[PDB]
Design a protein around this ligand. Structure first.
Ligand SMILES: C/C1=C/C(=O)c2c(C)coc2C/C(C)=C/CC1
Length: 273
């Protein structure tokens, strides 16, 4: 029940997703691993919000498992930051590649392309991570790497990022709906520095209309009443989570540098003290 324009739009997004989302993480390699005054108090609270163990399954069948330390007043809270920076960077590269495939995106001026990616890279990363999230085990399954939430569940949903992943996974979205959420997030006209606000706003509206129509044509079930509005509310929440985590990372970065050059570029860090 979609127009030909809407069908081609979804096709171009799915194509970009297929080409740029390495769902097995096969090419995530050479990453770092944890080694074998009121600022610090808040950096202490900032880091304890995402507490995961790490599993690495080798091709040979071997398994390495890392359990993180407890917070005990020292630098041990930073042990996983280089690894997560390498992951973030790998994911960001895929997101940048995704955007550059999309015709609606490459037709924007280069300055707006950069402003949009700076604004949304983190959000599209989280949308992709949600598709590998296992809500039954509290684990993001990234091919041969697994990230498992330390253990109750009601106390984990207090952290906005974790509640987001559980609540989004519960909607049981299709691949097509995930990629339309990525586009809606990517084409946000009100990111800092955007100049073609009107063109970007018009593109975002078309992506949201496509998503609304996709759901109407393919989801008649009572469980999916208001699904479009639930998705748009999650995107609003994702934007809030994005803002929280940008401030959170800039605080950590300020006392304990860890951002890769790509992250610095995305977060506006110039390289000068
Ligand atoms: C909440 C959370 C953190 C992240 O969003 C990132 C980022 C960003 C990079 O690596 C991770 C680890 C990962 C397995 C994802 C979900 C857990």
């Amino acid at each position: 029940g979609l127009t030909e324009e809407q069908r081609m739009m979804i096709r171009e997004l799915m194509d970009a997703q297929m080409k740029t989302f390495d769902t097995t993480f096969s090419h995530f390699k050479n990453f770092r691993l944890p080694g074998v005054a009121a600022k610090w108090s808040q950096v202490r609270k900032d880091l304890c919000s995402l507490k995961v163990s790490l599993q690495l399954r080798g091709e040979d069948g071997s398994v390495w498992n890392y359990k993180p330390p407890a917070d005990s007043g020292g630098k041990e809270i930073f042990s996983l930051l280089p690894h997560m920076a390498d992951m973030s960077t790998y994911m960001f590269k895929g997101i940048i590649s995704f955007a550059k495939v999309i015709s609606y995106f490459r037709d924007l001026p280069i300055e707006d392309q950069i402003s949009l990616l700076k604004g949304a890279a983190f959000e599209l990363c989280q949308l992709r991570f949600n598709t590998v999230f296992n809500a039954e085990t509290g684990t993001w399954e990234c091919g041969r790497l697994s990230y498992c939430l330390e253990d109750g569940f009601q106390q984990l949903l207090l952290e906005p990022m974790l509640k987001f992943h559980y609540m989004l996974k519960k909607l049981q979205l299709h691949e097509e709906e995930y990629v339309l959420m990525q586009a809606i997030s990517l084409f946000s006209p009100d990111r800092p520095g955007v100049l073609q606000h009107r063109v970007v706003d018009q593109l975002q509206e078309q992506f949201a209309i496509t998503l609304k129509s996709y759901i109407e044509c393919n989801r008649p079930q009572p469980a999916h009443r208001f699904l479009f509005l639930k998705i748009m509310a999650m995107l609003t929440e994702l934007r809030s989570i994005n803002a929280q985590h940008t401030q959170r990372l800039l605080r950590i970065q300020d006392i304990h540098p860890f951002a890769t050059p790509l992250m610095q570029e995305l977060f506006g860090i110039t390289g000068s003290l």
